[PDB]
Paper text:
Thogotoviruses, exemplified by Thogoto virus (THOV), are capable of infecting humans using ticks as vectors. Although the 3 polymerase subunits show low sequence identities to their influenza counterparts (∼15%, ∼27% and ∼19% to IAV PB2, PB1 and PA, respectively), THOVPol exhibits similarity in overall architecture to influenza virus polymerases (FluPols). Here, we report a series of THOV polymerase cryo-EM structures with resolutions from 2.3 to 3.2 Å to reveal the initiation and elongation processes of THOV RNA synthesis.
A replicative elongation sample was prepared using the non-capped dinucleotide primer pppApG. Cryo-EM imaging of the sample identified an asymmetric polymerase dimer structure (THOVPol-ELR-THOVPol-RER) and a monomeric product receiving polymerase structure (THOVPol-RER). The asymmetric dimer structure determined from the replicative elongation sample closely resembles that determined from the transcriptional elongation sample. THOVPol-ELR and THOVPol-RER within the asymmetric dimer show high similarity in peripheral domain configuration and RNA binding, compared with equivalent structures obtained from the transcriptional elongation sample. Therefore, we show that, starting from capped or non-capped dinucleotide, RNA synthesis induces highly similar THOVPol conformations. Without structural restraints posed by the primer tethered cap-binding domain as in FluPol, RNA elongation alone, starting from capped or non-capped short primers, is found to trigger re-configuration of the peripheral domains to allow the formation of the THOVPol elongation-reception asymmetric dimer without host factor involvement.
Author numbering:
A (entry chain C): 8 to 426, 428 to 755
B (entry chain A): 2 to 622
C (entry chain B): 1 to 180, 209 to 638, 645 to 710
RNA sequence: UGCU
């Protein structure tokens, strides 16, 4: 029973105290030092003894057990003649495991399933991949770090220990540790290790879970546009002579996170000084229950908007400069790619300044597109050499023209017009179309030669024979691949431009206003209630729910919202409010009701029911009114625009329901009368002895009961969280102080 | 990064240039404490307003120009050395945030500003508590408790306490006598301060020459090298015994064996044939380990050390001098080419029976087909049978090792053809082996069937005549001592097949990849310098003789072979460069051939490789 | 060798695999190391002057030589002080991010370094037992020595350990008390000599060299000091383009490929080695380079002193001579010390200190691979050199992009001279330059169009490991898989290696032919069903990564009834001697302690068939660690931080576990009653 | 006492 474990622990503690009178006078923190003292497990050349060791009379050492017969069918399975130690001393014949393969006690099938869980996952993963057709061919390897094995959930390295602590020993954690843990991974890991922990020891299960949520990237030679997303199958699907075609999609939420980040960046560029707006909004948005900073840290993707948001949070980005379908990486350059504000005065009133980027000094850029791989060297706007490793007879139109656009080498466009300039995208499209139908600028820029050794044909094809050949274009003699030695650190511009710190300045890496990507689904569980952009939601129900959660749960936001709606001032949620209420004629009555409710009760912004009534009145007040219709009295309830959802002033039904016990907004209990934590908790105390208040079992256990004071245990210390009485968080008070300092500095 | 989680990113980046943290004791902890103080300052002025202006004005981490500008407007002046952290509009007086280890017995530090003292547990002193509101106290206590949790989690309690106290040790220091000990063997002190101005002088160098012609390896002069290897190699044969176990085969051999000496060597006396006969008789009964006899002392060199030392002591005369060990130089023997030619002879069996792996995918089928092709093109060859004999002999000699035996152990070398018949290559006799290390030698009596006898090739072998079933055979019967490590290495000799398989696989797969289709039956033409002239030659026979040369190289691996092969890689690369119209340039005193020639002493296969290098052209146009 | 030089299908670079005699025996060393040790001692003195004058070189403390004294036609021992200063300044001015990372490491990472990192080493010379001992044993005995001589406790950090080492040096007499009981005495001079003593010893089983070399090991009194400088050097080297030592495997190949850009008219590629490395490098040059790095970083004095301790200790090194030079009268063999009778090392008699010999020049040992790499890299930074350089320790490759051949030759000679300025001599017979680049070698990696795979560098790992059938099969198959992934072995070689490994692995466990195991299985009607039992292989080329048991279960080759027996967690074969603790996810009692066995019955333990007090102390430490792990599940995921000593910490933890056990109050009382 |  449960008492046997306590008995065993007590006897172990007593024996360790008696058998080791010293080794406990040391501090507990000395464990990190003396856990490594495990000598006498060392051995030398076990492989040079295996043949003899197996062929010894008694090779196997096991504990004394009665399940192994002394003699079975004339063979002596075990030997107890010597018994020098008599404990872990009896020796067994080499055939004992073979004997046990039969004639042995069995185990439940659940145990067998639990033991082979990860190996079975690997086997089904192998037998579930489509074994395609082998495509033999010469291949130029690309050495990159790739994930060793797939993970059930990707978590940033800082949050792995807290996730494991929440999975295995929640009773010895604090609320900060719980907040830093990935709760989705916690649930997945708990479900996975429920049967596994019954057959694996503590450390074995801990590190099995760690491996299930650890990336563990390793460098391997891969094939471009054939990345198997994991090195589990590289020996089968890849080599220097073949690949096996496979059809596997991403099945990852990185695309949705890109969509969310793109919406945030696009809406942030429309305000004043977008950088701090984006930073503040990223600190107020939560996907599922995880803060946006942590989920950005979790997903280290190649995508542009994800990279911009990761840089805004101080993290790194792996994004590479991409033109159409060709990726460019600067091997080394004298100066960063500069930009020229080429103004076009084609018309006096109609003039557009279209800026392009070029090189100054010498530079060497690696390019990759499909199977085409190589590098080129340039000086200023002149190409010196190009080396390409491409399959024979391949058309090199698009990669070469992407190179020309990247370096601004050919000069029909950029500084010129080849026709009136209007917008960046139109000019780029015209450039590409013009050079697609007229690709002679490359030939007049590079020159022609009659040598047959040069592989680039005048029609921009690889190894096709022709009378003339394109000069200074040769085959890639040696493998070339980008590699950065120093840890690149990125700089985010005030206009949300991602820069890389080059020696002589700043190198542009990601630049919005030309990142073309259509809108996509948002990540599930996204919470925009605390952010300034609720209109990102495309669903009226979600918009209304987020707006009402913002107003109800916080008094100051309700104050600001009511004030802006009543006085027609600019509000962050003007678009949402205008899109929620149909075109009506209740604005004047709503503003009136606001006036009498404010005058009658100056102390209204403390009862959530009053906040709900004021929010309803303000939402109607800030609605889009109709001109050619006389104003009417505000109704008790109205219907959301383009929907059958009812919003009610009395909050008896529909979108908001305020029962005596609790308030429900959009089917979710936002506020509970006595058991809730809307204002949060603060730590308030670390002690080595239990304080004078209740000790909860786990941090989440104390978060549900909602006591005024409770403690948690974590490595011999007690943390007694009580309550938050301040009406502001640390982040925005720090923001206010920093802005006040900088707004005294400006004079 | 290095930012603590509880520290805000803006505060962390603002603190980077405020103080030079590298020179301060516990610079990281000092920066963290300053960040704590600035965060406390931020929390004190938590969006408080007064007369349409912030209640508190924060001086901390602000440029001195603005500080003086706003202090002048407030009719207050503070000295440069100590400046208050913040100023309160209500109850007008300057405040400074202080962190103290003990809240008790604390007095104001300066008479120009007030002190807002806090302890590491978040508590505040009485005047600070009454000045500030309850919300500010709770915020400060919560932030300080989060900081304390971070401190105790990272085991930084002592560093934080020392930083808060104000005084701490330099975290490292060197005393006086230790400094004197250190400065004993150097002309500079602990932190050297040479008086010379930095400069990179110009030094007259030399000129880089060009390797216009490839180096010529030195061919040593001396007697031809004897066959110095554990077993016979290409001159190995076997007797086709009737099917049965090892005991039956040994009984059948011994019961019908007529042994007569035809050539006796001084190294191996002909009288130790009785040792082999006794071992055969004992193994034919079922007792592989037998007792010692009189001629076992001669056969296994029992106690030879004592008589050698006694003879040395009796003959000891003269003066002590240094060792000056010498290695006799030997020339390339004629039998190396014969060994290469004879090792390629075809056989009637495959001699490579490796169980096939499973086949699930098409890649698996391709790999197994390639392996089967390689096995069938190198299997039916004498070298494969010799490799099998070496494997069996080495493993059966190594398995009876690891013990301290004072008796004699017999280790037969028997293989079985795919018809049940036993094939008796020979027998290895293991003598008294009180082995303790991995390099100490174990005495052996290697007796095995010989195909052809040669005095110059086998000077230490005593060849006997074996008469079994109206057939005539030969017996080697050499006395050798052989170490544990070498026996273990030769127990895994089957790995030698990988490199010729590597060459074959690379050729086939390159042909498949260039034309984008697998063939698996290609037997192309390989251009090689056979007799000093480039002539075509098929891939299969090339792989066969590559396997033969690799096997001959493996069993003759020694320091000379290791150095030779390590130092020929540079010359191989230089030749490959020269064959592609590339020039090779060398430093002033560059003689890459000397580091190869120093490794050419007496190894017959090293000499064979050197002659092969010399024969092929050295100048490329 | 003509058979290894194809001309039509493949190139000799691909056949460089054939220039390997591996799978043959590796050479070993037999007798006295005294001659080799004395040769390594005398070589630095022979190279200081252009004309070898050993007697005039033994009185030199700091090896600093004028630029006109630097030998250009041979090895040159010593450095130019002004050259070192200027080149270190140039290397600091460039690669500013590397210096920023160095400052980050000094401020953040260095204080968190623990002296338990010293336990990761192999056999270490012990100044107490005058022998070679495993690193944990030597570290623990050194910690006890410091604790009982300084009368205080040593902090877990490495800085505290180094400070304790420095503090003990200030004492006049030090003593060591240890269980057998026995007491040994150290003076300041004796303990200083033991601090600066390197234990020399042969290097066995080394391939690729004709002559045997000697390796050395330092004591724990200086390994800690070397650890800081090595970690700082690694931090710097990870952020500089010209380094090649901190990266390895495929990352090193990617870094090399990033520099194989040949676009100018004359594009050379120089690949070579440095001759007489580790003995032409004065530690004072490394001192000066580190001092310049720390001065230009604004570092205080204490860190400079800490960084300079190890190189001075190596300036005062005492190399342990062997058991004597071999002398013969007739056919006798006697071993005599250096100074007994004349030899070729008579000039070094004055440096004899007991059985050890001093050497103020050179390093004598590769204890500063990263620092020597930094010293090599600082010399590269100069205006004349415009190519790409990669240096690991003493193997380097250089890529030239020059307009004319004469300019390339001038750059190559400038490279040679600037290497010689800091005491690094290019091996003339080992450095080869190809004027059109495209063919080269670095760390035995040959590239012509791409880095070609090198078979026979993976053959030594193809032998079964000898632990148990499951572990052996798993690790052999995964080694083969890694070789396939890295390009060393292709489809055919991979499958052939699989077959050879499988056949040897089945032989080693008595699964082929008629053996005792096979006979027992046959007479008792036990079908194998497993690879180690003689069954047909289940693993294929594409299934190298799959576990045997899971794959057999999936394919139906292993039925569930036998699975219920093989994977029994209660089998006697792999039963543990003590109970183990188990987690219980979402349970009233989250920890249950019970007897356990390794699930697989074929993961048995093979008996091995044959400072004792320190071993019992290790066992006591293991017991304390086991009880701490049982009572503190959270130290398995994060570092231990509970306050107080071990006894009180576990006492309160055991209590708190009891009051949450959900039992009766009086039962909790009776459980607490018997807690010591 | 049995590896092609």
């Amino acid at each position: 029973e449960s008492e046997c474990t306590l008995r065993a622990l007590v006897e172990e503690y007593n024996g360790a105290c008696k058998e080791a009178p010293k080794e406990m006078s040391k501090q507990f923190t000395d464990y990190n030092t003396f856990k490594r003292y495990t000598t006498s497990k060392k051995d030398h050349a076990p492989q040079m003894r295996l043949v003899y060791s197996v062929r010894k009379p008694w090779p196997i050492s096991m504990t004394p057990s009665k399940e192994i017969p002394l003699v079975f069918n004339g063979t002596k399975l075990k030997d107890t003649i010597l018994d020098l130690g008599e404990s872990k001393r009896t020796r067994a014949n080499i055939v004992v495991p073979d004997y046990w393969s039969k004639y042995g006690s069995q185990t439940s099938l659940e145990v067998v399933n639990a033991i082979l869980y990860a190996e079975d996952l690997k086997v089904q993963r192998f037998f579930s991949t489509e074994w395609g057709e082998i495509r033999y061919g010469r291949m130029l390897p690309f050495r990159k770090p790739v994930q060793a094995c797939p993970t059930i959930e990707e978590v940033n390295p800082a949050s792995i220990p807290h996730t494991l602590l929440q999975v295995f020993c929640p009773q010895y954690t604090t609320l900060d540790s719980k907040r830093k843990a990935h709760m989705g991974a916690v649930e997945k890991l708990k479900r996975v290790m429920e049967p596994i922990c019954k057959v694996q020891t503590q450390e074995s299960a801990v590190h099995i879970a760690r491996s299930l949520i650890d990336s563990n990237k390793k460098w391997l030679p891969t094939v471009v546009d054939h990345t198997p997303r994991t090195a589990e199958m590289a020996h089968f699907l890849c080599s220097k002579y073949h690949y096996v075609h496979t059809n596997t999609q991403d099945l990852s939420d990185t695309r949705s996170i890109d969509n969310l980040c793109g919406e945030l960046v696009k809406r942030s560029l429309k305000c004043r000084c977008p950088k701090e707006t984006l930073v503040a909004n990223l600190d107020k948005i939560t996907i599922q229950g995880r803060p946006m900073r942590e989920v950005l840290a979790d997903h280290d993707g190649e995508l542009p908007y994800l990279g911009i948001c990761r840089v805004a949070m101080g993290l790194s980005t792996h994004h590479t400069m991409k033109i159409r379908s060709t990726k460019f990486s600067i091997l080394n350059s004298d100066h960063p790619r500069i930009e020229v504000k080429k103004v076009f005065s084609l018309s006096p009133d109609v003039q557009v300044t279209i800026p392009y980027r070029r090189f100054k000094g010498k530079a060497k850029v690696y390019f990759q597109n499909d199977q085409i791989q190589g590098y080129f060297s340039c000086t200023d706007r002149q190409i010196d050499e190009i080396k390409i490793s491409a399959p024979k007879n391949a058309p090199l139109l698009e990669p070469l023209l992407d190179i020309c656009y990247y370096g601004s080498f050919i000069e029909p466009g950029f500084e010129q017009t080849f026709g009136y300039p209007a917008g960046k995208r139109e000019f780029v499209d015209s450039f590409f179309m013009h050079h697609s139908k007229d690709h002679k600028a490359f030939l007049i820029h590079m020159g022609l030669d009659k040598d047959l050794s040069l592989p680039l044909s005048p029609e921009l094809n690889w190894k096709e024979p022709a009378l003339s050949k394109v000069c200074r274009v040769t085959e890639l003699d040696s493998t070339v691949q980008p590699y950065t030695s120093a840890t690149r650190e990125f700089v985010l511009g005030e206009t949300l431009n991602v820069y890389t710190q080059h020696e002589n300045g700043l190198e542009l890496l990601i630049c919005p206003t030309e990142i073309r990507s259509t809108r996509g689904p948002l990540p599930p569980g996204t919470n925009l209630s605390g952010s300034e952009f609720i209109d990102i939601y495309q669903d009226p129900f979600s918009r209304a729910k987020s707006l009402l959660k913002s107003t109800i749960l916080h008094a100051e936001r309700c104050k600001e919202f009511v004030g802006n709606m009543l006085e027609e001032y600019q509000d962050p949620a003007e678009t949402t409010v205008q899109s929620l209420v149909p075109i009506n004629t209740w604005g004047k009555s709503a503003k009136r009701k606001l006036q009498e409710e404010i005058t009658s009760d100056p102390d209204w912004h403390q009862c959530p029911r009053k906040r709900a009534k004021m929010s309803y009145l303000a939402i109607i007040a800030g609605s889009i009114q109709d001109r050619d219709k006389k104003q009417t009295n505000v109704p008790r309830a109205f219907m959301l625009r383009g929907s059958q959802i009812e919003y009610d002033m009395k909050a008896t039904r529909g979108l908001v329901v305020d029962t005596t016990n609790r308030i429900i907004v959009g089917g979710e209990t936002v506020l509970r009368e006595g058991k809730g934590g809307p204002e949060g908790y603060v730590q308030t105390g670390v002690f080595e002895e239990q304080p004078r208040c209740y000790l909860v079992d786990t941090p989440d256990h104390g978060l549900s009961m909602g006591l005024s004071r409770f403690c948690v245990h974590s490595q011999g210390r007690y943390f007694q969280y009580e309550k938050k009485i301040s009406i502001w968080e640390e982040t925005d008070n720090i923001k206010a102080t920093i802005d006040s300092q900088r707004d005294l500095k400006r004079r | 990064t290095d930012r603590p989680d509880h520290i805000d990113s803006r505060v962390w980046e603002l603190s980077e240039t405020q103080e030079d943290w590298i020179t301060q004791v516990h610079g990281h902890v000092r920066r963290v404490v300053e960040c704590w103080k600035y965060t406390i300052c931020c929390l004190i002025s938590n969006m408080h307003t007064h007369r349409g202006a912030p209640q508190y004005d924060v001086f901390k981490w602000q440029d001195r120009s603005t500080i003086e500008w706003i202090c002048s407007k407030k009719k207050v002046q503070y000295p440069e050395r100590d400046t208050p952290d913040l100023y309160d509009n209500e109850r007008a007086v300057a405040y400074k945030v202080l962190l103290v280890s003990d809240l008790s017995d604390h007095s104001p530090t300066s008479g120009i500003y007030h002190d807002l003292a806090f302890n590491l547990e978040g508590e505040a002193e009485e005047s600070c508590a009454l000045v500030l509101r309850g919300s500010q106290l709770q915020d400060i206590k919560g932030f300080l408790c989060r900081a304390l949790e971070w401190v105790v989690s990272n085991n930084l309690t002592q560093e934080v306490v020392e930083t808060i106290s104000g005084e701490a040790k330099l975290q490292f220091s060197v005393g006086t006598t230790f400094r004197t000990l250190l400065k004993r063997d150097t002309d500079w002190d602990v932190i050297p301060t040479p008086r010379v101005e930095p400069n990179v002088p110009r030094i007259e160098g030399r000129r880089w020459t060009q390797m216009k012609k490839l180096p010529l390896l030195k061919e040593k002069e001396g007697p031809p090298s004897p066959w110095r290897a554990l077993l016979l190699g290409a001159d190995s044969e076997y007797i086709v015994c009737p099917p049965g176990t090892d005991q039956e085969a040994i009984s059948w051999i011994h019961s019908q064996s007529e042994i007569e000496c035809i050539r006796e060597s001084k190294s191996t006396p002909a009288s130790v044939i009785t040792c082999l006969t006794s071992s055969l008789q004992s193994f034919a009964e079922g007792n592989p380990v037998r007792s010692r006899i009189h001629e076992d002392i001669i056969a296994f060199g029992i106690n030879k050390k004592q008589e050698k030392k006694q003879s040395a002591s009796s003959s000891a005369s003269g003066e002590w001098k240094r060792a000056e060990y010498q290695v006799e130089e030997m020339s390339l023997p004629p039998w190396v080419e014969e060994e290469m030619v004879l090792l390629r002879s075809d056989q009637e069996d495959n001699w490579i029976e490796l169980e096939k792996n499973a086949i699930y995918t098409e890649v698996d089928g391709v790999a197994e087909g390639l392996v089967d092709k390689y096995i069938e093109i190198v299997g039916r060859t004498k070298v494969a049978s010799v490799i099998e004999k070496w494997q069996i002999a080495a493993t059966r000699t190594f398995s009876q090792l690891h013990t301290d035996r004072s008796r004699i152990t017999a280790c037969p070398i028997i293989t079985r053809d795919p018809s049940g018949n036993c094939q008796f290559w020979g027998m290895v006799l293991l003598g008294p082996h009180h082995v303790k290390r991995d390099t100490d030698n174990a005495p052996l009596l290697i007796a095995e069937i010989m195909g052809e006898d040669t005095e110059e090739k086998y000077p230490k072998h005593s060849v006997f005549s074996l008469k079994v079933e109206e057939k005539q055979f030969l017996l080697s019967l050499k006395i050798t001592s052989f170490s544990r490590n070498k026996l273990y290495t030769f127990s895994n000799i089957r790995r030698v097949l990988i490199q010729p398989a590597s060459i074959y696989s690379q050729v086939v797969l390159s042909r498949a990849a260039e034309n984008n289709s697998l063939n698996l039956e290609v037997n192309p033409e390989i251009q090689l310098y056979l007799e000093g002239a480039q002539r075509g030659m098929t891939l299969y026979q090339w792989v066969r003789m590559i396997l033969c040369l690799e096997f001959l190289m493996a069993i003759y691996n020694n320091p000379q072979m290791e150095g030779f092969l390590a130092n020929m890689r540079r010359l191989h690369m230089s030749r490959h460069a020269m064959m592609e119209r590339r020039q090779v340039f060398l430093p002033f005193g560059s003689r890459p051939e000397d580091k190869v020639n120093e490794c050419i002493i007496n190894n017959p296969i090293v000499a064979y490789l050197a002659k092969g290098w010399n024969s092929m052209p050295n100048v490329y146009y | 060798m003509n058979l290894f030089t194809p001309l039509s299908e493949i190139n000799p670079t691909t056949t460089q695999e054939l220039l390997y005699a591996y799978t043959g025996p590796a050479p070993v060393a037999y007798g006295t190391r005294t001659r080799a040790v004395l040769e390594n001692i005398i070589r630095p003195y022979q190279y200081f002057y252009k004309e070898p004058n050993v007697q005039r070189a033994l009185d030199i403390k700091t090896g600093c030589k004028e630029p006109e004294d630097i030998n250009v036609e041979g090895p040159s021992s010593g450095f130019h002080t002004a050259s070192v200063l200027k080149l270190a300044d140039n290397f600091f001015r460039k690669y500013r991010p590397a210096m920023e990372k160095l400052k980050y490491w000094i401020l953040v990472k260095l204080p968190k370094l623990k002296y338990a990192e010293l336990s990761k080493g192999r056999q270490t010379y012990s100044f107490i037992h005058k022998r070679n001992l495993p690193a944990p044993i030597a570290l623990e005995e050194t910690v006890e020595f410091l604790e009982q001589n300084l009368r205080r406790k040593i902090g877990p950090t490495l800085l505290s350990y180094c400070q304790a080492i420095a503090d003990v040096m200030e004492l006049d007499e030090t003593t060591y008390e240890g269980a057998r009981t026995y007491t040994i005495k150290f003076s300041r001079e004796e303990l200083w000599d033991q601090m600066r003593t390197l234990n020399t010893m042969w290097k066995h089983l080394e391939r690729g060299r004709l002559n045997r070399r000697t390796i050395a090991t330092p004591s724990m009194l200086i390994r800690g000091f070397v650890k800081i400088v090595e970690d700082a050097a690694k931090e710097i080297l990870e952020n500089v383009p010209t380094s090649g030592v901190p990266v390895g495997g495929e990352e090193k190949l990617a870094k090399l490929a990033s520099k194989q850009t040949f676009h100018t008219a004359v594009t050379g590629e120089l690949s070579g080695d440095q001759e007489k490395f580790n003995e032409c490098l004065d530690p004072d040059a490394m001192r000066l380079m580190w001092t310049v790095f720390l001065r230009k970083l604004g570092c205080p004095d204490w860190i400079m002193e800490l960084f300079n301790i190890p190189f001075m200790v190596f300036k005062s090194k005492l190399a342990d001579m062997g058991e004597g030079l071999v002398y013969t009268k007739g056919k006798l063999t006697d071993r005599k010390p250096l100074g007994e009778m004349p030899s070729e090392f008579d000039d070094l008699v004055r440096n004899v200190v007991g059985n050890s010999i001093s050497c103020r020049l050179g390093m004598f040992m590769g204890m500063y691979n990263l620092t020597s790499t930094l010293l090599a890299l600082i010399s590269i930074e100069r205006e004349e050199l415009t190519g790409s350089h990669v240096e690991s320790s003493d193997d380097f490759i250089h890529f030239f992009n020059c307009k004319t051949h004469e300019e390339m030759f001038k750059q190559a000679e400038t490279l040679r001279l600037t290497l010689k300025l800091v005491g690094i001599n290019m091996s003339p017979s080992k450095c080869i330059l190809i004027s059109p680049a495209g063919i080269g070698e670095f760390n035995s990696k040959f590239h012509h169009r791409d880095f070609v795979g090198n078979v026979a560098t993976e053959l030594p790992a193809l032998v079964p490991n000898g632990t148990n059938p499951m572990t052996d099969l798993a690790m052999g198959l995964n080694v083969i898989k890694h070789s396939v992934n890295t390009g060393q072995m292709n489809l055919c070689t991979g499958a052939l290696a699989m077959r050879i490994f499988n056949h040897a692995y089945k032989y080693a466990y008595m699964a082929l032919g008629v053996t005792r195991r096979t006979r027992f299985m046959e007479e008792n009607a036990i079908t194998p069903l497993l690879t180690n039992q003689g069954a047909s292989p289940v693993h294929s080329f594409s299934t190298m990564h799959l576990d045997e048991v899971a794959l057999r279960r999936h394919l139906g080759l292993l039925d569930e009834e036998t699975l219920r027996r093989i994977l029994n967690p209660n089998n006697p074969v792999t039963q543990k001697g003590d109970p183990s603790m188990f987690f219980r996810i979402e349970n009233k009692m989250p920890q249950i302690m019970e007897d356990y066995s390794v699930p697989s019955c074929f993961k048995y333990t093979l008996s091995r068939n044959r400072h004792k007090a320190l071993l019992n102390k290790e066992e006591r430490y293991q017991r304390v660690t086991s009880i701490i792990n049982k009572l503190f599940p959270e130290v398995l995921i994060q570092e231990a931080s509970a306050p107080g000593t071990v006894r009180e910490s576990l006492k309160r933890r055991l209590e708190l576990v009891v009051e949450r056990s959900d039992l009766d109050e009086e039962r909790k009382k009776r459980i607490l009653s018997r807690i010591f």
